Each structure stands twice: as C-alpha cells, then as structure tokens.
Amino acid sequence: SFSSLYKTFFKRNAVFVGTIFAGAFVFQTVFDTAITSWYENHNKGKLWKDVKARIAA
Amino acid sequence: PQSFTSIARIGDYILKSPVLSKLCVPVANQFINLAGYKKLGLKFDDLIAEENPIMQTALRRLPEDESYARAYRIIRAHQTELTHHLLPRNEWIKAQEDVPYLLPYILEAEAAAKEKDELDNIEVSK
Amino acid sequence: AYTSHLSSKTGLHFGRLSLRSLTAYAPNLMLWGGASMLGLFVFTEGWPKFQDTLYKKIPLLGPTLEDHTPPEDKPN
Amino acid sequence: AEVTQLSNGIVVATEHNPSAHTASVGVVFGSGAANENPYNNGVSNLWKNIFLSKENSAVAAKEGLALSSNISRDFQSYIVSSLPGSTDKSLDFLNQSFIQQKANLLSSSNFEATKKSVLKQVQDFEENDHPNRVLEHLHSTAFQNTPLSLPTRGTLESLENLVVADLESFANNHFLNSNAVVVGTGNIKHEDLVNSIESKNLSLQTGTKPVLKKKAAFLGSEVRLRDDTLPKAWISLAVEGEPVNSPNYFVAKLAAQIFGSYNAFEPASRLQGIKLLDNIQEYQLCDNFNHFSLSYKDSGLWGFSTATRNVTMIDDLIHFTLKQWNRLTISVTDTEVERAKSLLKLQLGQLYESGNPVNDANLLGAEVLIKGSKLSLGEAFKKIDAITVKDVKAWAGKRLWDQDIAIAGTGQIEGLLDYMRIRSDMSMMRW
Amino acid sequence: MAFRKSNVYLSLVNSYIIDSPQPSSINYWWNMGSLLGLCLVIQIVTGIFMAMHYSSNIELAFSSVEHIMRDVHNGYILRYLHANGASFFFMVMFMHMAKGLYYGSYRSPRVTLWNVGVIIFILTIATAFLGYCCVYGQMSHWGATVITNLFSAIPFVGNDIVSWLWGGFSVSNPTIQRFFALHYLVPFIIAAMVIMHLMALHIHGSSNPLGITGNLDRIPMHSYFIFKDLVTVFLFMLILALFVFYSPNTLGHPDNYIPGNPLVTPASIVPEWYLLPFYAILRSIPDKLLGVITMFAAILVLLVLPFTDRSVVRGNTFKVLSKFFFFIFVFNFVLLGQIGACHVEVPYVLMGQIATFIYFAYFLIIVPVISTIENVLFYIGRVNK
Amino acid sequence: MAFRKSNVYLSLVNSYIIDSPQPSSINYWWNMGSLLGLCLVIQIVTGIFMAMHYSSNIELAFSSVEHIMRDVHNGYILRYLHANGASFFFMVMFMHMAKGLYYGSYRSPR
Amino acid sequence: PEHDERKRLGLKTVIILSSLYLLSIWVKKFKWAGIKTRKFVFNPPKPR
Amino acid sequence: KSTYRTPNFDDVLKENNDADKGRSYAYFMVGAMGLLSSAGAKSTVETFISSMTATADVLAMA
Numbered sequence A: 001s002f003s004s005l006y007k008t009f010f011k012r013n014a015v016f017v018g019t020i021f022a023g024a025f026v027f028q029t030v031f032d033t034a035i036t037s038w039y040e041n042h043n044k045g046k047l048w049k050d051v052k053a054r055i056a057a
Numbered sequence B: 001p002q003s004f005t006s007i008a009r010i011g012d013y014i015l016k017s018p019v020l021s022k023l024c025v026p027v028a029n030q031f032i033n034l035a036g037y038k039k040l041g042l043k044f045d046d047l048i049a050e051e052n053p054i055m056q057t058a059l060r061r062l063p064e065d066e067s068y069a070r071a072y073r074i075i076r077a078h079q080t081e082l083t084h085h086l087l088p089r090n091e092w093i094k095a096q097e098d099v100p101y102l103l104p105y106i107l108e109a110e111a112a113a114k115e116k117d118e119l120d121n122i123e124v125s126k
Numbered sequence C: 001a002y003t004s005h006l007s008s009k010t011g012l013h014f015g016r017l018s019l020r021s022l023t024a025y026a027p028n029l030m031l032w033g034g035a036s037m038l039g040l041f042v043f044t045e046g047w048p049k050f051q052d053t054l055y056k057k058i059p060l061l062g063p064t065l066e067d068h069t070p071p072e073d074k075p076n
Numbered sequence D: 001a002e003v004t005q006l007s008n009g010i011v012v013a014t015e016h017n018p019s020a021h022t023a024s025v026g027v028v029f030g031s032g033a034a035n036e037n038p039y040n041n042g043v044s045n046l047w048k049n050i051f052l053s054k055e056n057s058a059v060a061a062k063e064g065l066a067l068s069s070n071i072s073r074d075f076q077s078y079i080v081s082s083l084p085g086s087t088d089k090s091l092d093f094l095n096q097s098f099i100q101q102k103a104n105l106l107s108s109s110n111f112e113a114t115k116k117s118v119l120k121q122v123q124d125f126e127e128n129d130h131p132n133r134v135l136e137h138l139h140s141t142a143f144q145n146t147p148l149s150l151p152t153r154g155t156l157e158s159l160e161n162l163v164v165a166d167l168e169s170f171a172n173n174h175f176l177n178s179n180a181v182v183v184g185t186g187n188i189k190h191e192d193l194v195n196s197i198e199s200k201n202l203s204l205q206t207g208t209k210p211v212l213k214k215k216a217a218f219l220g221s222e223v224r225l226r227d228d229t230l231p232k233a234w235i236s237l238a239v240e241g242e243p244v245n246s247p248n249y250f251v252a253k254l255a256a257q258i259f260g261s262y263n264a265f266e267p268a269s270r271l272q273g274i275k276l277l278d279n280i281q282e283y284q285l286c287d288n289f290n291h292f293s294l295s296y297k298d299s300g301l302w303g304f305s306t307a308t309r310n311v312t313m314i315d316d317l318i319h320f321t322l323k324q325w326n327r328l329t330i331s332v333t334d335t336e337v338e339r340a341k342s343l344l345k346l347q348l349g350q351l352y353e354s355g356n357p358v359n360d361a362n363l364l365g366a367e368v369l370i371k372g373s374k375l376s377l378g379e380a381f382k383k384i385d386a387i388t389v390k391d392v393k394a395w396a397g398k399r400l401w402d403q404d405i406a407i408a409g410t411g412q413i414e415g416l417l418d419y420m421r422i423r424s425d426m427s428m429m430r431w
Numbered sequence E: 001m002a003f004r005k006s007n008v009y010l011s012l013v014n015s016y017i018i019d020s021p022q023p024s025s026i027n028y029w030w031n032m033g034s035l036l037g038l039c040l041v042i043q044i045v046t047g048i049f050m051a052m053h054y055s056s057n058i059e060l061a062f063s064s065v066e067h068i069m070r071d072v073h074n075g076y077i078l079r080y081l082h083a084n085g086a087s088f089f090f091m092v093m094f095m096h097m098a099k100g101l102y103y104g105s106y107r108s109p110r111v112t113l114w115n116v117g118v119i120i121f122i123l124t125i126a127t128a129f130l131g132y133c134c135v136y137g138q139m140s141h142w143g144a145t146v147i148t149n150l151f152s153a154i155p156f157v158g159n160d161i162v163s164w165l166w167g168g169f170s171v172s173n174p175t176i177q178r179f180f181a182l183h184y185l186v187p188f189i190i191a192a193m194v195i196m197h198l199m200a201l202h203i204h205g206s207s208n209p210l211g212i213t214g215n216l217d218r219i220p221m222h223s224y225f226i227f228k229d230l231v232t233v234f235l236f237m238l239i240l241a242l243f244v245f246y247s248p249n250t251l252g253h254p255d256n257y258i259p260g261n262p263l264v265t266p267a268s269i270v271p272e273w274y275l276l277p278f279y280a281i282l283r284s285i286p287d288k289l290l291g292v293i294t295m296f297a298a299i300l301v302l303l304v305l306p307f308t309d310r311s312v313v314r315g316n317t318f319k320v321l322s323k324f325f326f327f328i329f330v331f332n333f334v335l336l337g338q339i340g341a342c343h344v345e346v347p348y349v350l351m352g353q354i355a356t357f358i359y360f361a362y363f364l365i366i367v368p369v370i371s372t373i374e375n376v377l378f379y380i381g382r383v384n385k
Numbered sequence F: 001m002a003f004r005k006s007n008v009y010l011s012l013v014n015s016y017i018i019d020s021p022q023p024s025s026i027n028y029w030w031n032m033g034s035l036l037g038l039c040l041v042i043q044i045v046t047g048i049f050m051a052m053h054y055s056s057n058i059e060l061a062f063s064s065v066e067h068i069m070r071d072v073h074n075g076y077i078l079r080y081l082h083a084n085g086a087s088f089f090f091m092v093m094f095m096h097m098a099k100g101l102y103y104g105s106y107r108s109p110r
Numbered sequence G: 001p002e003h004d005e006r007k008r009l010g011l012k013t014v015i016i017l018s019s020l021y022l023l024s025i026w027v028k029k030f031k032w033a034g035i036k037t038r039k040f041v042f043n044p045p046k047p048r
Numbered sequence H: 001k002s003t004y005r006t007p008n009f010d011d012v013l014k015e016n017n018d019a020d021k022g023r024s025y026a027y028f029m030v031g032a033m034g035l036l037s038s039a040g041a042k043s044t045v046e047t048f049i050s051s052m053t054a055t056a057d058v059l060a061m062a
C-alpha cells in the first residue's frame, strides 16, 4: 500500500511538515529520556543519588 | 487607487442633478483655484500619478501632439518650481484650457481592465 | 434548440483572491494551521509554563518530562 | 453510423457518408514503428515511400486513383483514394500492386532511388524541422530502451543499413490478415465494399505478428541537444499520460485542453481564457506552445511543447507553465473545465468529422485496430460532458502531482535549467 | 567606459551618489534622508568612542558616564554629541516621515520603501530606549521599569517575557548589561536596514514635490545635490553645535543626573521627548494590554496609509483639505507629546484620549474621505456637463 | 517573471544563492567559503549572547568570563562555542586561502 | 562543575549530528544523481 | 552513432521503478533530515534563550 502511504503522508506538503514537527516533538521527548537513562545507568554508583543512598544506608 | 470610473460616476451624478450642481460646482471651482496647479502651467491630467498600468496604457494611447504638449507642461512646471516662482499671469492655464484630455483614454482602459477581470472570474450558469 | 446568449455570473473576487480558490484552499489552510501549531508545540517544549499547562497532560510523554529531584538536593 | 464486420479472415470497417464526393479505400495495419528494432528503424518509412513510388503512382494515376500513406507508432496505413464510382479499381490496385505483386515495387533501381529519397528526406527533417524532432527526441528519452522510442521517420544510421530483404522481412512479419483492417471512408456502403472484398479473393498472409518482449515503460529523463546557432529554443516537456482505452483518456485530453495551445503572433490567440497568458504575456516568455495528450497502445505522453526566442527567460516560462499544471491538482475552477469541455468537443469534431476521407480512414483503422470498434462522436461527447472537476483533480493527483518528467530540447537552451530544478516545480510547498 | 562605472564597488557608489538621477524640482525637504545618514554616522562614531570608556555594570554605569564627562579628554564633547545627536536624529526622522506623509512618497511604487522605513523607525525607537536606559539615571531605571513592566499584561506568558527581559526579578545588573549589548548591536541592524532602504529607493527613484512623473527632467546627483545637501549638512552641524556647546542639557531631563535608585519614585516618570507621543498613546487607554497594543498600533498604523490614501494625484501639494488636515495631524502630534510630558490629571486625560483618537482617525477615517471628496471636486471643477 | 526574480531583495538572494551559476566540477574545497560564513554567524551570535553578561573592567573581566562559565545557563556552551569556533574559523580560513593558493583563484580576473 | 551535563549533551549532540551528517550525505547523492550520471555524446557537425 | 540511441544507464537504473515506492523512499530520508534538523534547531534556539533567561547568582537571591 505504498500508494496509500504516499497519498496520505507525502502528497500534501502541509501534512508532510506537520508530520515532521510531530515526529520531532515525540523524538525530543523519547530520545532525551533514552540518553538520560543510558548515561545514568552507565554511571551507576558514581552519581549523587547513589552516594545519597549510601549515606542513607 | 480610487478607480476613475467611480469618480466619473459620482461626478456625473452630481452634475446631472440641478441642486447638487449649483451647490457643489462653485465649491469645486474655488477648490481648483485654491489648488494652484494652473499657476505652474499644468492642467489636471498632468497631475495624475502615472505609475500604474492603466495610466501607462492611457499614456501609450495618447496621440502625439497631446504627448509633446504634456511633456512641455511637465518640464515647465519642474523648472518653475525649481526656481521657486510661478509662471507669469499670461502663462497660467486658463479655465477653458483645462480640459480633461486623458480622461476618455483612462476611462476606456479602466473599462477594458474591469471587463477583463470580470471575465477572468466568471461562473458559467450550469 | 438554438442558444443565442451565454448565461454566466461574474463570480466573487477581490482582484486576485477568489471565493472559489479560497474554498479550494481552505482545508490545506487548516492543515497548515495544525502544522504551525505542532511547530509551536516543538519550539515551546522547554518552556516550563507550557509544560505545566499542556505537555505534562500527555499520556505517555507527560510524566516523562517532569523531574524527580527531592527538595534535599535542590539548592533553591 | 460506422459499420465494422469480421469477414472470414479480415476486418472490414466502413464509415459511409453520402455527402462526400470521394471515397477512400485502404488497409490499415496495426504494426507501426513500435514494431521495429533499433537496427531496422525506418523500414516502415521505406514501405510508405515505395508504396508512394513514381512507378507505383503512375499506375494509380492512370486510373484516377490517388495514394496516401501514413506511418505512426502504433499503426501504418496504405490508403487509395478515388471517385465514388471507382471503388472496384481502388480494391484492384490495393490487391494487385501492394498485396499480391509486391516484388515489383521492391525491385532494384526503384528501391535504391526510394532509399536515396528517404535518406535525403530524413536528413532534411533532422536538420530543419526543429519542433517535430524535439517531440521525436521526447519519445526517444521518455521510453528509452523500449519499443515506443523509435522515431517513425527512422534514424539516418539505421536507414543506410537497409536492404530489400529487410522490407520483405517486415512485410512477412507484419502485413498479415490478423493484423490488417481494410477501411472504406467516403461514400461507399458497407455492403458494397464487403461484396467487393468477397468477390476478388483478398487475403494478405496467414501467420501472426511477432509479440514484443517488453511493454513500453516511461522512464523520467532528459536530452539536451543544444545548438547555439539556432535562433529559437524548442523544448518539449511531458509526464506519462494515459494510454488509449484508459478510463482517463478523455480526462487527459480535457486537461490538455484546459491550458490549450497558443500563438503569440495571432491577436485572437492572445485573448484565450488561459490563466497562464497573464504570466507569459508581460515579458513575452514564449512565441507559441501547445499542450498535447498523446496516447498509444501501451502508454502515452501528457505535457506541452513550446518555442521561444526569449532565451534568457526559459526558466520563467517552464516555471509558470508547471505552476499552472499544479492548479489541476489543487485549484482548477469550474469554468476552466467548462471552457475546456466546449473546446475539446470542438477540437474532436474538427478532428474526426472533417471533409477529408483520408484522415477519417486513418483514425477509423487505428480505433478499430486497437479497440475493435469505433466510438461514435455522440458517445464521446457524453463522456466529455460527464467529466467533473473532481475527475480532473483525481487524474492530476495520479499523473501530474510530483511525478517524473521527460524533457527534450534543442537550440539555445542554455537558459533551460537541469532536471531536478525543473522537476521541483511538479509539486509546490502548498503555496 | 569610465572606471567609476566599470569597477565593482565604484559602480555602486556611482549609481547611488554620483550618477543617481534625481528630479530637478526636489527641494530642501529631500535633504533630510542624507541628514539622517549623517546622524547615524555621528551616533555610531561617538558611541564607539564612548564604549571604549563605558562600563555596563549597575554599580559602574552612572559612574562611568560621569568618568566620560570628567576624566576622558573631550569626553563631554562625545557624550553631549551622542545625546543631542540622538535628539536631532529623531527631529530629522520626524521631518523625513512627515515629508513622506505629505508628498505621497508611500504610494504604489514605493510601498516597499515606506515599509522598510517603518522598520527603521521601530529599530531606532528601540535603540534610543536601550541607550537611554544605559546611562542608569533616575529616568533610565524607572523608564526601564515601566516600559518593560508593560509586557506583563500579555495574559499567557507575560511574567515569563518580563522575567526574561529583566534577567531577574526587577531591572538590575543583567538588565543593564543586556541593554548595553543590544544598544551596541541594533545600530548595525539599522545600517543594514538603511542599505535596504537605499535599494528600495534606487529601484524607482525619488519623488518630487509636484507629484507628477520625474522621468522627463533629471539631474545627476553629484555636483548638484551634493552641494545642495552640503548646505543642510552644515546647517544641521551648526544647530547641533549650538545645542551641544551652549545648551547641552536642554533636551535632557534633569532627573538623569540622580543615580539609579530602585527604592525612590521620582514623582514623574517620563521618557525622552521623542518617545513622548507614543507614551501618551500608551497612557490614554485605561488598560495595560490594550495600551501597549495601541502604542504598537500607533507605530504600525503607517502601514495602512498606502491603502487608505484614496487619491489619484500624489502628494498634498495641490490639495487644500488634505493640506489643512495634514498640519492638523502635525500639531496633534505636538499636542500628544506635550500631553505625555504632563502628569495624569483631569483635563490632560481627556485631551490625550481625544488627541489619540485624532491620531488614529487621520490615517483610518480622515484621509480616505478627504481624498475621495477631493477626487470628486477635482473632477467636477473642470468637467462641464 | 518569478517573484524571486522581480523583487528587490529576493533578486539579490536569488542571484547569490538560488540561481547563481556554479561550475559542475567544483569539489568540497569550495564548501570552505560557506563554512566561513557559518563560522562567522556562529561567532557573532554567541559573542552577543556572551556580551550580555561580560564585564570589561580589568577587575571584572576574568571573573565575568568565569561567571559565564558558572552562573549563565548553557554559558559554557556559549564560551566553548566562541573559543573553539574561533579556532575552527581559522582552520577553515587557512583551508580557504590554501585552496585559493592551490587552484590559482588569485589570478588575472579575481 | 558542568562536566556531567556537558558530556550528556555531548552524547545527544554527537548522535544527532552524526545521523544528520549521514542523512545529508544520502540527500546529497540523491539530489546529485541526475547530474552525476550524465552522458555526453559528440557527433561533430557538418561544415558550412 | 545516432542521437536516438540513448546510452547505457542500466548500471544506475533501479530494476523496479514504482513511483510511490521510490518517492516514499526519497521523502522518508528528506523528512528524517528535516526531523533531526527541527530537533536540533529547537535545542539551539532554546539554548540561546535559556542563556538569556536568568542566572543562578540571582536565583539564589530570589
């Protein structure tokens, strides 16, 4: 259904740039969360939450 | 910006009415005498701003003797207002000399452009 | 039969824009309004007032944007 | 109004018209120049010109018969015109000289003279006739490496390699009974022509024509045959159009008629109701253009073909034309479609019912070779009147919005930009 | 051909200054554009030579301006030249805009010229405001407080825009350093906009005081309008030299020599005099949102004037009623400035509201009606029927 | 003609960016000039947004740059962008001059 | 003291700019394919 | 050699030439570049504006 895919998303440039901005919003939120989670998980034990939990226990 | 056909419509309505004529025509004659374009040797159809395609059309369609005379009146008014004087009183444009000479050409080009726009935006009755 | 006249109306226009072209353009004008609204939703995402009013009401991306620092390791 | 009937080997189609004063009888084959190779290209042109030899034309002119022949990409016709009481002589000549006794036109020292004549003729076409060769190169790059790109004139290098055996080989492969339609236009009756065809045993050959291995496929491209010593700049430009017997065939014709044709030196063509002439009459962007919708058996072409001596503003011409083409997709109004409906019915009536029974025989033989029957002008007018604005919008979304183009140009086309800059005009950013 | 035409850059200087065909009949009102260019060169040069000594911290702004006035050699010359040249910049700018309003220089060819001019007017108003707030006197701090607290009337993000402009919670050190960076930057946007003004001027040429076509009698700009502009350049320098060397603090408010105190209201917060009509159009409306919207509309209503001037001859040279109402507009502007200088008291509120209404009714109501009536009178005074 | 052609400012933009005839055979060394324009835009924008906070007294210069690094939100982004972008401005400018030196873009017309 | 957040934003920025660089290479090759695969032939013209 | 004999583009032509398929493939890449350019432009503009917003030195004195 590539004809339906083209006719929906890529025929009108308004719907095209609207899908670009909607994808950019979803991408910003999800990708920022993914980099934050990967960075904080790679550095486990070295962050202040882990030092604070060690002080708490 | 105001179409010349509209000015002709309102002015013809004023002139064809006997009350509005005798009320507003002396006001316009004193307005034209106070306007003072005749003291520079200009008739009024030299004063119309020509930088639009209707006026460029009418000025293209002007006959050549009126074109050369209009050119001289415009250059003479430029030199007169450069010297910060007026023309001498025998070189002023008389009232009977101030005839609308460009006006049929303007109104004809205006009617042609309005008809062209109206035919550009028609809706055939089907 | 035989038709001698061409019967037509003069439409509705403002020189360049026509009513017919406006009705033919109007849903894509609504689409461009929606696209520009999504563009403002992008370029105002970091704004915490618009996060509080709009973007934290989103089901799956809403609580994602808010932070979880307690009031013990915030200086102010 | 017209009667086609399949007699025991062959299809006889007549379009009787008693108001005519001649009667054209002929046989239209359905193997045009799409049925060539790159290497025998122009053998149909040579069959056309040895049908029209001086030796073959003296025989017809002694009996009061005029010969007319036509090569297209789909069909090729061999038509014998005569006075209305002279249909038996037309069939006698068409039987004897062209069908049975075919190895007398193909003699040496007649084939050699006619090959020299078509060599000079194709060279004179290739040097002087600039719009039609730009259209030929438009087919040459729209359908390249595919049967429809062969020019019906034949090239100059493939015409020089041709011998008598190539014409005999093309004759045995294509001039057949399953491939022919024998056509009678003018004022001969269908009963009379089919009685004459049953009277003298009229059979061409028995086999079946060779099936082409690859169907015609549009490939978006361009050819730039710039020639800076020519005065003007000829440029054709086209998208893929609907083939014949497509449901959008008349819709493609109508959309070609929305933008019509134009001739800037004619004062009554300035006043046409196209919205493109406001754009191109300010700086006089073009000298003439014509929007065409060609349709063949496999595919077609839809676009325009122009010529301009404003060689610096070729880009503004192409830009304003393609930006008007986008209006069919987005905002084609109703009165454009109604004006084009009236003008398309007028164009179709001037094309089909003219007073020339040669052209009617050509069109009738083609339309009953491809479709098997000829669509009447009334039903065509009803199909044209049934086209709405939504149909033109759907067809222009399918075939015109952001589709590949084939371009072809010769002359001073330095101002013509490259492909992607022109192809970026097929779709606006919705403004 | 000549080297002034064949070169890359000298062809620009030639086609703008040396061979630029002006109409022969233009008068000394056409000198104000060259005078505005002179004002801009004066402002930029004296601004750089004081920015070499000025310090933008909130503890050192007023002390550094007084360091310029005392310790810097000829620094009083530079400071009074900058301040009174800004006042003269706005005088000549009002004359340029008023001669454009009068002689119809906003009509059909030069709509782009008029609109780029309005953009330059907005940017120059903004530059003057930021530079007045750079001194950090008493009128500077409180003018900054009032005019940037205006933007807290926008109901959605007003507090956000206000605390983004301030850089904090009131007008303070980040506000003054922000304003100094912007006051350095924005005049180069004004210089680029002046080059765009000159492009839009060059594509169609100047107008003349008759309103008629000037293509017939033209004169190259060099050796005629160069010295005709040199006359007004020396006259502008003479009046500016008088106001710099003999009355240097006449056009300034005397409260700016008090250092900027956030805890003392100076009992009449008033901006510089050239922003006073817009301050009056601000204070006329009894609402903070509609007031700043009306002030921005007071600057932006000049964009309506090409499409409301319904006349068919250009310029009020030959129009009696249009001349009378043009000078009614001019003295209404002077009344609006004198009203905005005043306190918010009983006859002044009603006079300011009436003057604001006359200001907006000039462009929107008076000009189309008067120009239509003059079209009809011009027709029927000479058509005999 | 087209609006990018007939306009006053869009004709400049068109003849310098949009319709400007470049040769077909120029390589990625001709991207250095556009990179220098990008570098200069980066330097001007980051420098203005740091001059909003920089204090040019001799007692406050280093401490105000240290305030940009510490107190200004994303201020280290602006400072490192300015310093490393000036270094990259000179890297790309040396490549631009060396391209003019190799391909002879100094010669008789230019 | 910006060290952790600076390396975080560096990871985000480097991922986005590497993806944009590879997409821009593809878009360059796509826009330039029609010029990159041109063919010129030269049949020399007839003398006058 | 004729001009009607188009040369061998066969090494660069894709074997299937469906229109919607190839256009969806091209515009998905152009849209992905515009996607990540929109995210980067938003982050850049918010970086400069957030630099202009306030400082920690005054947010402590809030």
Ligand code: HEM
Residues within 6 Å of the ligand: E040, E043, E044, E046, E047, E048, E049, E050, E051, E054, E065, E068, E079, E082, E083, E086, E089, E124, E127, E128, E131, E132, E134, E135, E183, E184, E187, E190, E252
């Ligand atoms: C567009 C032209 C300019 C205008 C209209 C303008 C306007 C002003 C005004 C009105 C003042 C207040 C003067 C006072 O009352 O003491 C001022 C101050 C100042 N301006 Fe400008 N200015 C302009 C250009 C510049 C430029 C380009 C610079 C920087 C290089 C600059 C630097 C200053 C400085 C440092 C002050 C501080 C106080 C002083 O010393 O006067 N100005 N400006």
Ligand code: HEM
Residues within 6 Å of the ligand: E029, E030, E031, E032, E033, E034, E036, E037, E040, E093, E096, E097, E100, E103, E105, E106, E110, E113, E114, E115, E116, E117, E118, E120, E121, E190, E194, E197, E201, E205, E206, E207, E208
């Ligand atoms: C820094 C400010 C400005 C400069 C340097 C400037 C410069 C010039 C110059 C040199 C001219 C040509 C000479 C003349 O006609 O007077 C001119 C013309 C003009 N300017 Fe300005 N200008 C400026 C601001 C403005 C403003 C604020 C407006 C009004 C909105 C404006 C509108 C015009 C108009 C309409 C013309 C054409 C006048 C005519 O030819 O009849 N300009 N400008």
Ligand code: HEM
Residues within 6 Å of the ligand: F040, F043, F044, F046, F047, F048, F049, F050, F051, F054, F065, F068, F079, F082, F083, F086, F089
């Ligand atoms: C031509 C482009 C420019 C270049 C090559 C340039 C170069 C530099 C360099 C190398 C530094 C020192 C960086 C360091 O080691 O910390 C610097 C610092 C600085 N520049 Fe620029 N600069 C440019 C544009 C600007 C502009 C236009 C401004 C003013 C608005 C500016 C404002 C600053 C400031 C405030 C500093 C202070 C120290 C810092 O925070 O980096 N820059 N510049």
